[PDB]
Write a protein that binds this DNA or RNA. Structure first.
Lengths: 51, 128, 234, 147, 132
RNA sequence: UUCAUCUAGACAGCCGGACGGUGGCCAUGGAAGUCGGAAUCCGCUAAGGAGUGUGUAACAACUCACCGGCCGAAUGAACUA
């Protein structure tokens, strides 16, 4: 009932993100470093967990 | 035995009679279908095991006459419906599955939850 | 016939409402969903009157009445009195009653023909109950309880009584009331059966937590129960 | 009117399959739809895959088996993992069978259609010992005859 | 789980022994705590008419004794203001024991019952003979 | 500081095609290249895997390995303070 053409439209903004391990921020998926300054611009990034 | 009737609670309408009921009675009880398996994102990782409930909490009935205005108008792959006079969530239609709380699978189901509807006998009084 | 609904979030209905043959009274502070259960099934047959008695919302337990008459306690204000006499028809008689036993609904259980009253009610009252309602007045207690109103629901067809009652005591009440009597529970086993539900000839409303074995027993003694749209079109 | 086509996969004795999911948007059918399947899969095994497509208009039945797929090589035999890995004397029978398959193969004659049909049967023993790879690498029978 | 009630005067602190109105064997109640009370240094939490209080039975049948079980206050000796204007007060304190849902174990209540206790709790209003 | 790609057309992106036997076959409510275990074949070929991935109830849709053009001079890695 979600009509998965729209779910793939919805998953880009919510699900297809990368998470910093330190500061838990919601980062773009192909980014290398965290944009937040409080964690020292780290390169220790993990994917967001899929449902 | 005698015929039975399913009346809606707070609507008081006979939603479905007997000569119905694809009841599918025995569960599977083996490890893959009697158990509820909750997988993870990758590599078929099992995180949760849920044991099935005792009794199947639904009523699997044929497509009836009063569902015809809901089934034809905006036909989709899943949804719900109501009593025809109180508009409360009584049962849903699913062409997929939704086994039972107790679990097998069925065919496409018209699942009618045994909460907020009850089962009566259509015959005369018991006279206790 | 046999409907189930609840006031704001409480299961009991006879506390908050009074159902008779010719009229019906409801408490004021309710949702539209509570009122729709009475408005749909009664329709325009009998008037559903919003009111309060003595500054409360428990008008089922405070008032007592039948087809022909309505009794209100002394603490009823005169503004609440005139609101009743306007909306209710000309046939019903409305009388304020001077009691030491203030709550009239717990004291008096009655219908078209036979009334049961609390045994410590006085003699000058017993004339006024017979004069207003037009009903013969009997003093008796259901097996352990003096409060015949809360523990005995009654109507023209039959009567649902307190569960802890011996069969020989149910026989002696059946002779006096001239109707068959059934012990039962309401609202998943509450002994308060007079306030757990209301009933008349056409309708019997109960709480939501009444299970279906309890509701089957209720509809049987009241004999209210009795289809083309259901069918198989595959 | 309207012309619509859907496809049905596998099933031996009786199966709702694709139609139940696809029968939702269409006219609802339970007894007749499996019966229309039962007309098609008659004299076909239940263990084997059977591929069909049914075109209906106002509760119509269409029974066909296209057999461009592995249905042909599965058709000739007598029936953890029930293996299909058997030996068959394909060469004379498969040459008639591949010509049943090669209605378009979109190639040249039966020689190019014999090099693909035997490769579809990646399980069966075929002609004598091996009927696959190096054994069915060269085919010196039928060939120009079916042309 | 407590419904809305207009404020009345607080007249039963912790330590009070009120009478037991119903007929479930008990003769008095020892209030230990009041549901929904506030917090302030050195302040005893107090009961009122209509509040649901935790109480132990000191005198009665030994089945009821020595266990904490909640209770509903049905009379109050402290005078209080009603909004229509009058100040009224009963002769003694009283309570009925109840399960934590709010259903009542007692079959009937002797003596008068406070009117604000009746509207707040339906099961009290079922068993009550006299409501003020 | 040290290595490596590069006008013999690089990295980045864009622009085409991604086909036939193909829902292959056991696997079970349903798995069609993608939950997976063992197999890894042919044809059309400039080139294209019984399939690197996203995704789908099951397909799809997209993307990649691969195939050929355009855009046109800089690009990549490991470190040190």
């Amino acid at each position: 009932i979600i009509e998965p053409s729209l779910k793939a439209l919805a998953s880009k903004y919510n699900c297809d993100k990368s998470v910093c391990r330190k500061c838990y921020a919601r980062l773009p998926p192909r980014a290398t470093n965290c944009r937040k300054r409080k964690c020292g611009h780290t390169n220790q990034l993990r994917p967001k967990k899929k449902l | 035995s005698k015929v039975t009737a399913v009346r809606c609670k707070k609507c008081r309408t006979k939603l479905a009679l007997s000569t119905s009921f694809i009841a599918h009675d025995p569960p599977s009880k083996e490890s893959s279908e009697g158990h509820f398996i909750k997988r993870a994102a990758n590599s078929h990782r099992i995180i949760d095991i849920q044991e099935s409930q005792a009794n199947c909490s639904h009523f699997f009935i044929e497509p009836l006459k009063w569902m015809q205005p809901e089934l034809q108008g905006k036909q989709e792959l899943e949804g719900k419906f109501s009593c025809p006079g109180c508009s409360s969530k009584v049962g849903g239609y699913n062409w997929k599955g939704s086994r039972c709380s107790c679990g097998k699978w069925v065919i496409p189901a018209i699942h009618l939850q045994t909460s907020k509807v009850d089962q009566f006998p259509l015959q005369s009084t018991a006279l206790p | 016939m046999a409907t189930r609904t609840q006031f704001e979030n409480s299961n009991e209905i006879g506390v908050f409402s009074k159902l008779t043959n010719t009229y019906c009274l409801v408490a004021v502070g309710g949702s539209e969903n509570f009122y729709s259960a009475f408005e749909a099934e009664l329709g325009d047959a009998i008037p559903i009157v919003h009111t309060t008695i003595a500054g409360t919302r428990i008008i089922g337990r405070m008032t007592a009445g039948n087809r022909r008459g309505l009794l209100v306690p002394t603490q009823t204000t005169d503004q609440e009195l005139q609101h009743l006499r306007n909306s209710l028809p000309d046939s019903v008689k409305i009388q304020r009653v001077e009691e030491r036993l203030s709550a009239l609904g717990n004291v008096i259980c009655c219908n078209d023909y036979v009334a049961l009253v609390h045994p410590d009610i006085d003699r000058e009252t017993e004339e006024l109950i017979s004069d207003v309602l037009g009903v013969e007045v009997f003093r008796q207690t259901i097996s352990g309880n003096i409060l015949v109103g809360s523990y005995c629901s009654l109507s023209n067809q039959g009567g649902l009584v307190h569960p802890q009652t011996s069969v020989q005591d149910q026989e002696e009440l059946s002779s006096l009331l001239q109707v068959p009597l059934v012990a039962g529970t309401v609202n998943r086993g509450s002994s308060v059966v007079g306030a757990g539900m209301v009933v008349n000839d056409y309708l019997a409303v109960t709480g939501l937590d009444t299970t279906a074995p309890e509701l089957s027993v209720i509809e049987s003694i009241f004999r209210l129960q009795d289809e083309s749209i259901s069918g198989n079109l595959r | 009117x309207x012309x619509x086509x859907x496809x049905x996969x596998x099933x031996x004795x009786x199966x709702x399959x694709x139609x139940x999911x696809x029968x939702x948007x269409x006219x609802x059918x339970x007894x007749x739809x499996x019966x229309x399947x039962x007309x098609a899969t008659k004299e076909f095994k239940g263990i084997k895959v059977t591929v069909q497509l049914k075109i209906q208009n106002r509760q119509a039945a269409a029974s066909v088996v296209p057999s461009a797929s592995s249905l042909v090589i599965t058709a000739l035999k007598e029936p953890k993992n029930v293996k299909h890995s058997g030996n068959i004397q394909l060469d004379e029978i498969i040459x008639x069978x591949x010509x049943x398959x090669x209605x378009x193969x979109x190639x040249x004659x039966x020689x190019x259609x014999x090099x693909x049909x035997x490769x579809x049967x990646x399980x069966x023993x075929x002609x004598x010992x091996x009927x696959x790879x190096x054994x069915x690498x060269x085919x010196x029978x039928x060939x120009x005859x079916x042309x | 789980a407590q419904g809305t009630k207009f404020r009345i005067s607080l007249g039963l602190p912790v330590g009070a022994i009120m009478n037991c109105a119903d007929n479930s064997g008990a003769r008095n109640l020892y209030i230990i705590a009041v549901k929904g009370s506030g917090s302030r240094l050195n302040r005893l939490p107090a009961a009122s008419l209509g509040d649901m209080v935790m109480a132990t039975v000191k005198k009665g049948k030994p089945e009821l004794r020595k266990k904490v079980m909640p209770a509903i206050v049905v009379r109050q000796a402290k005078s209080w203001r009603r909004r229509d204007g009058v100040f009224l007060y009963f002769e003694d304190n009283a309570g009925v024991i109840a399960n934590p849902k709010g259903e009542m174990k007692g079959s009937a209540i002797t003596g008068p019952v406070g009117k604000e206790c009746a509207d707040l709790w339906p099961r009290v209003a079922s068993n009550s003979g006299v409501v003020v």
